[PDB]
Design a protein around this ligand. Structure first.
Ligand code: BCL
Ligand code: BCL
Ligand code: BCL
Ligand code: BCL
Ligand SMILES: CC[C@H]1c2cc3[nH]c4c(c3C)C(=O)[C@H](C(=O)OC)c4c3nc(cc4[nH]c(cc(n2)[C@@H]1C)c(C(C)=O)c4C)[C@@H](C)[C@@H]3CCC(=O)OC/C=C(\C)CCC[C@@H](C)CCC[C@@H](C)CCCC(C)C
Ligand SMILES: CC[C@H]1c2cc3[nH]c4c(c3C)C(=O)[C@H](C(=O)OC)c4c3nc(cc4[nH]c(cc(n2)[C@@H]1C)c(C(C)=O)c4C)[C@@H](C)[C@@H]3CCC(=O)OC/C=C(\C)CCC[C@H](C)CCC[C@H](C)CCCC(C)C
Ligand SMILES: COC1=C(OC)C(=O)C(C/C=C(\C)CC/C=C(\C)CC/C=C(\C)CC/C=C(\C)CC/C=C(\C)CC/C=C(\C)CC/C=C(\C)CC/C=C(\C)CC/C=C(\C)CCC=C(C)C)=C(C)C1=O
Ligand SMILES: COC1=C(OC)C(=O)C(C/C=C(\C)CC/C=C(\C)CC/C=C(\C)CC/C=C(\C)CC/C=C(\C)CC/C=C(\C)CC/C=C(\C)CC/C=C(\C)CC/C=C(\C)CCC=C(C)C)=C(C)C1=O
Ligand SMILES: COC(C)(C)C/C=C/C(C)=C/C=C/C(C)=C/C=C/C(C)=C\C=C\C=C(C)\C=C\C=C(/C)CC/C=C(\C)CCC=C(C)C
Ligand SMILES: [Fe+3]
Lengths: 302, 281, 240
């Protein structure tokens, strides 16, 4: 076997990397976690340190709060029985209020209120994490791209659980918490709307979703392939193009007749990915608020 | 015709077949021997689709559609218009894709870089071949294959999945879909990380991998790192397609009932089948 | 209606976005050139972009792309045919000359530096706290080339300090001098390190570096260039 750089042949270990201080309040980094040899065949061996600020803690707490809320309703649905719980794990489902309560918070705890409670914990957990996304970047003087991109994931999630239920007039329109139910909600959502294959935004979304597997497979292979000239050090190849970046561009140019720069290909990346949910969320947003059947709409576009 | 740093690499050699015979470029395109294979297979197959498009009555790409032989024909050939055009176009398709990979191997050799790209492409080729050749052969007919039309092949996706109820319950399809999703997550993250370092705050100087490592650890207590993430993209991608093929090679061959039903192996275990309470007692 | 407005607008946004993305990837390699180095007639339908400036962090200066472009190095190749589009033969030894799959670019002849200004890559011996943590340790293995002849002994590993990753084997010749091999082009096994790209007699010819505790981006390019070149150019002495 000639060698492929998929796993490492040697791990090498130094002092724990505490990382650049920049405008970061170091009060808040934890200290280093331990070192997984296992992780280290593949990527980095070192776990931690993590930073937890006040916003940090907030997010992570309501995080667990949502998880723990879903989880009692599951133990309850299991009637407190540990073996039943394990057995019926994918079957338990925490559902939203019935269509009757509309958008009200009135619904009893045991038929929708528990849902909104968990939904409330999820909403502050996600959004706080979001601002955590930006803040960690500010402290380091990095650009804002992670938060912008994370905003695209949030837009679908937003439209699914909140924007769309409001616009349609009730919380029953939104998605159960549970492994099978959310699958069922999905399949079901499509049926009620005329099959999402006829919704042009769905189709676009697939093109990007598949497209991201294409791009990353291309890109990840391209790098591993030029990794024998230090290709993986993309930022310094951006600052000072080396043979790795050249031989990369020219693979794609000789194959398909155009190519990227080491920096550009990352902008293909961020967009290919972000467009998946951007596009998706427009597609759901419009479902049933503006088009009740995609087939029908499709029949005479306008 | 050339990129500014390009001449120095345009040297003779690396070919797989043909020696120096088809070793040249046309505009930016390298020409394999396999560049010549691909053009022949791809132009023949396009010609046969344009052909087929008249035998069928339309010139509109949203209508052109080429269907496999009907189930009745089993594994045999089938007249040109009753499915054989499809049989020949599929042979062109495979011919054209396998050439493309082999052409990519040749480009790899001239350039002194590794074989990762075509190896990766190969998983796509295998997925296609799973839909149009492996699965139909394990099942008895070319007619289980999908047809070549923009909108008619989604017809085939709906029809095929709905033969097992909600396809969501196909457990390999679940793992596949997880791989796809995680892949798009890694793609968003990698892109935005690298850009956020090369394009920092403003007036500010370019960040370093130490920054990229640092931001990640700050956010989630971990960073896989710059070699890591490219290995991961590759793995996530390829794993997605591998479980894509696996979920389809097994559907209709070793499992052919309603996928939702498979799950009963779990719920029906001795230790708890008959305990009462919860959703299944 | 609204859903038709959104889709059609989206197609428009999508076209500008493709355009923007396409132009962005022109900040290198462009303008296109003829096989003789002068500007090609046709540059395709995309204009160059207004240029941008990266500020490099250790008073290392600027990059501003696109900008005027050259190889900053002689290219020992000549045309092998009378019109655009054929291979250009190496006029010399391709390996010694840095052409073809042995090519390197004229990157800066300083070392890439960590986030803290220190050289990123050091021999493990001058790197405090750094040791081999898992897998077979190469150090002290004999190094074998594609002719199955021994060409030296591994005497340290050069490591990436901030990513904690092996990046070269420093290997010693009959000579007593050393060369760097890219970690990615060697196979570390039980009783030896095998190197396929190079025959035993082509190790002396590996590009040498100026300090023995630093590599520069330029040296790194010439070394990686050279060994990758061997896959094509040492195929004469490669056995089975
Ligand atoms: C993969 C599992 C299913 C399947 C499920 C879906 C579903 C579901 C959807 C599509 C959609 C698409 N699929 Mg399909 N599709 C399958 C297999 C294929 C094959 C194949 C050779 O096996 C091809 C060529 C396509 C092609 C297509 C495109 C028409 C469209 C957007 C794809 C995309 O962006 O990919 C990522 C790739 C890129 C961004 C690279 C660009 C790919 C280009 C645009 C493809 C052009 C194909 C061309 C029109 C065929 C022309 C003949 C040539 C002249 C020879 N599908 C199998 C049977 N496909 C979407 C659609 O809108 O349907 C109308 C959609 O919703
Ligand atoms: C029978 C079912 C219907 C169908 C119904 C739907 C429905 C309904 C929807 C989709 C959606 C999608 N479908 Mg469809 N779909 C069908 C058939 C297909 C087929 C196919 C035929 O092969 C394909 C390839 C797809 C593909 C796709 C995707 C492009 C798109 C989802 C994008 C995404 O990334 O979601 C994954 C990403 C997210 C959901 C965002 C998550 C972000 C949040 C912020 C993260 C929260 C994390 C949480 C806190 C947990 C943390 C735990 C941690 C470990 C700590 N569908 C059939 C036709 N499909 C979605 C879409 O937009 O379409 C318009 C959608 O709503
Ligand atoms: C109602 C429909 C069913 C369903 C039934 C099916 C069926 C049936 C299938 C899938 C398949 C898939 N489904 Mg499902 N699926 C459903 C729900 C979903 C949802 C969702 C959110 O609800 C999602 C995200 C998915 C996702 C997926 C993936 C796991 C997989 C598609 C990718 C793939 O296989 O690529 C593999 C990629 C290819 C095959 C492309 C091959 C490219 C080739 C090699 C080269 C082409 C080049 C081109 C010709 C060049 C043109 C010229 C140039 C453009 C210039 N399914 C619903 C429940 N799903 C498919 C699968 O697993 O396939 C194996 C499949 O067959
Ligand atoms: C896009 C339209 C549907 C949808 C369609 C599907 C389908 C279809 C499938 C999943 C599956 C998954 N979905 Mg879901 N899923 C939706 C929205 C969500 C949301 C959310 C909005 O908050 C969450 C938290 C989940 C959580 C999950 C996991 C159980 C699993 C893998 C996710 C992942 O790969 O991330 C990555 C990273 C973790 C670190 N889904 C929307 C409503 N999802 C799959 C599954 O395997 O179920 C068991 C599966 O097959
Ligand atoms: C790891 C798998 C992921 C992946 C990877 C991947 N794809 C790849 C590669 C890699 C590494 C390449 O190197 C190669 C490439 O050159 O990319 C630019 C490629 C490629 N993947 C492509 C398409 C493609 N990949 C897809 C998917 C995926 N590719 C996976 C998700 C899809 C999806 C998701 O649906 C599509 C549509 C092409 C851009 C390119 C392959 C180009 C090629 O092989 O060119 C040769 C052939 C022709 C130019 C003409 C076609 C020949 C005729 C026989 C016509 C008819 C065939 C027929 C089936 C028509 C179908 C009709 C449809 C409407 C359904
Ligand atoms: C852009 C489209 C893709 C996307 C992007 C994306 N997701 C993101 C980001 C981005 C850019 C983040 O920055 C953020 C993150 O921090 O990643 C580490 C995140 C994130 N998306 C996550 C999950 C997630 N993303 C999903 C999807 C996707 N993410 C899309 C495919 C899915 C799927 C497929 O359904 C899941 C499950 C988390 C890893 C993280 C948000 C963590 C959060 O809000 O925490 C609350 C805290 C606790 C519960 C504790 C029991
Ligand atoms: C750091 O490195 C990297 C680069 O470099 C610096 C790169 O560029 C890239 C490549 C990535 C990009 C350039 C971004 C765009 C990528 C996509 C969105 C993928 C989608 C690609 C397409 C949709 C276009 C595909 C075009 C194809 C497949 C061929 C077009 C074919 C023709 C019209 C004619 C083909 C010629 C033939 C038949 C061959 C034989 C020759 C004769 C003419 C005879 C990556 C991944 C990379 O990581
Ligand atoms: C330079 O480093 C860094 C970045 O990029 C420049 C990155 O973005 C990321 C990206 C990290 C992730 C969160 C991706 C997560 C990967 C997994 C959890 C793998 C598991 C996959 C499944 C869910 C499928 C289940 C299948 C079975 C059971 C088989 C990291 C960590 C990184 O630090
Ligand atoms: C082992 O035992 C213990 C005790 C640890 C507990 C175990 C628990 C387990 C295993 C739990 C499993 C949980 C699961 C399976 C969760 C799955 C969730 C899924 C699958 C999908 C979710 C999709 C969610 C969406 C789309 C939600 C969007 C939500 C919003 C937009 C917020 C909505 C707004 C609300 C509720 C209003 C409140 C706020 C204002 C400002 C008015
Ligand atoms: Fe990258």
């Amino acid at each position: 076997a000639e060698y492929q750089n998929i796993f490492s042949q040697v791990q090498v270990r130094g002092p724990a990397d505490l990382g650049m201080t920049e405008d970061v309040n170091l009060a808040n980094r934890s200290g280093v976690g331990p070192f997984s040899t296992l992780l280290g065949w593949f990527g980095n061996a070192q776990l931690g340190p993590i930073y937890l600020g006040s916003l940090g803690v907030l997010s992570l707490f309501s995080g667990l709060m949502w998880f723990f809320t879903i989880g009692i309703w599951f133990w309850y649905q299991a009637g407190w029985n540990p073996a039943v719980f394990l057995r019926d794990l994918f079957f338990f489902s925490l559902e939203p209020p019935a269509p009757e309560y509309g958008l009200s918070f009135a619904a009893p705890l045991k038929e929708g209120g528990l849902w909104l409670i968990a939904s409330f914990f999820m909403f502050v957990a996600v959004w706080s994490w979001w601002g955590r996304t930006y803040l960690r970047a500010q402290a380091l003087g990095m650009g804002k791209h992670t938060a912008w991109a994370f905003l695209s994931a949030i837009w679908l999630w937003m439209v699914l659980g909140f924007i769309r239920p409001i616009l349609m007039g009730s919380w029953s329109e939104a998605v159960p918490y549970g492994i099978f139910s959310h699958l069922d909600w999905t399949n079901n959502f499509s049926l009620v709307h005329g099959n999402l294959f006829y919704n042009p935004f769905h189709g676009l979304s697939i093109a990007f979703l598949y497209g991201s597997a294409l791009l990353f497979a291309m890109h990840g292979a391209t790098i591993l392939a030029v990794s024998r000239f230090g290709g993986e050090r993309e930022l310094e190849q951006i600052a000072d193009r080396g043979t790795a970046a050249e031989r990369a561009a020219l693979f794609w140019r000789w194959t398909m007749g155009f190519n990227a720069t080491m920096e550009g290909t990352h902008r293909w990346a961020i967009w290919m990915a972000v467009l998946v949910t951007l596009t998706g969320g427009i597609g759901i947003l419009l479902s049933g608020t503006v088009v009740d059947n995609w087939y029908v709409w499709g029949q005479n576009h306008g | 015709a050339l990129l500014s740093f390009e001449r120095k690499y345009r040297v003779p050699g690396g070919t797989l077949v043909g020696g120096n015979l088809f070793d040249f470029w046309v505009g930016p395109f390298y020409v394999g021997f396999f560049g010549v294979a691909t053009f022949f297979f791809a132009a023949l197959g396009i010609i046969l689709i344009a052909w087929s498009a008249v035998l069928q009555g339309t010139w509109n790409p949203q209508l052109i559609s080429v269907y496999p032989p009907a189930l009745e024909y089993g594994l045999g050939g089938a007249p040109l218009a009753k499915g054989g055009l499809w049989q020949i176009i599929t042979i062109c398709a495979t011919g054209a894709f396998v050439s493309w990979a082999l052409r990519e191997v040749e480009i790899c050799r001239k350039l002194g870089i590794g074989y990762h790209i075509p190896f990766a492409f190969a998983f796509a080729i295998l997925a296609y071949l799973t839909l149009v050749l492996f699965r139909p052969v394990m099942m008895g007919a070319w007619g289980y294959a999908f047809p070549y039309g923009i909108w008619t092949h989604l017809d085939w996706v709906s029809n095929t999945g709905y033969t097992y109820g909600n396809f969501h319950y196909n457990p390999a399809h679940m793992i596949a879909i997880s791989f796809f999703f995680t892949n798009a997550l890694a793609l968003a993250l990698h892109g935005a990380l690298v850009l956020s370092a090369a394009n920092p705050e403003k007036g500010k100087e370019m960040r370093t991998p130490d920054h990229e490592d640092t931001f990640f650890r700050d956010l989630v207590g971990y960073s896989i790192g710059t070699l890591g993430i490219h290995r991961l993209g590759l793995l996530l991608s390829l794993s997605a397609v591998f479980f894509s093929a696996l979920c389809m090679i097994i559907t209709g061959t070793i499992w052919f009932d309603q996928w939702v039903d498979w799950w009963q192996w779990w719920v029906k275990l001795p230790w708890w089948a008959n305990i009462p309470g919860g959703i299944n007692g | 209606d609204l859903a038709s407005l959104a889709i059609y607008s989206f197609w428009i946004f999508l076209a500008g976005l493709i355009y923007y993305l396409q132009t962005e990837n022109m900040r290198e390699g462009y303008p296109l050139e003829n096989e003789d180095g002068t500007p090609a007639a046709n540059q395709g339908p995309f204009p160059l972009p207004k240029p941008k400036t990266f500020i490099l962090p250790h008073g290392r200066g600027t990059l501003t792309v696109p900008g005027p472009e050259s190889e900053d190095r002689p290219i020992a190749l000549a045309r092998t045919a009378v019109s655009e589009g054929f291979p250009h033969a190496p006029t010399g030894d391709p390996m010694k000359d840095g052409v073809g799959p042995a090519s390197w670019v004229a990157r800066r002849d300083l070392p890439e530096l960590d986030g803290h200004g220190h050289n990123k890559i050091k021999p493990m011996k001058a790197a405090a706290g750094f040791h081999v943590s898992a897998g077979k340790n190469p150090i002290g293995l004999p190094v074998r080339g594609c002719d199955l002849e021994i060409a030296g002994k591994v005497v340290d590993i050069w490591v990436d300090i901030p990513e904690q990753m092996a990046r070269f084997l420093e290997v010693e010749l009959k000579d007593g001098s050393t060369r760097l091999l890219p970690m990615q082009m060697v196979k570390v096994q039980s009783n030896r390190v095998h190197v396929n790209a190079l025959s035993s007699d082509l190790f002396a010819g590996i590009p040498t570096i100026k300090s023995p505790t630093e590599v520069t981006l330029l040296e790194e390019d010439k070394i990686c260039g050279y060994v990758a070149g061997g896959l094509m150019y040492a195929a004469p002495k490669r056995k089975s």
